[PDB]
């Protein structure tokens, strides 16, 4: 009644390797440490593909969830209990 299913799947994706695209086209693949009700994602050990194609290694990242276009989660969470 209060919290939705996709934020439960986002909380279920913590510890896993998620790849989050942001509003400025930058793709961040790495270990999602923590995520909140708003989609503020503290992630770590991040491989970053910018818009040009350059890849950087940013070891501790906190993305503001407003700017997140989407996150690609592991398909393990296709069997997560809140997706039933």
């Amino acid at each position: 009644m209060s919290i939705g299913v996709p934020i439960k799947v986002l909380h279920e994706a913590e510890g896993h390797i998620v790849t989050c695209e942001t509003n400025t086209g930058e793709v961040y693949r790495g270990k999602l440490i923590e995520a909140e009700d708003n989609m503020n994602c503290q992630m770590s050990n991040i491989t970053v593909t910018y818009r040009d194609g350059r890849v950087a290694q940013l070891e501790q990242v906190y993305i503001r969830g407003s700017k997140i276009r989407f996150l690609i989660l592991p398909d393990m969470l296709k069997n997560a209990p809140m997706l039933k």
Binding site: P6, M39, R69, F70, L73
Partner: peptide, 12 residues
């Protein structure tokens, strides 16, 4: 192919 996409509602 991506997999399990959590699309934020702002961009839909």
């Amino acid at each position: 192919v991506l997999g399990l996409v959590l699309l934020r509602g702002e961009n839909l």
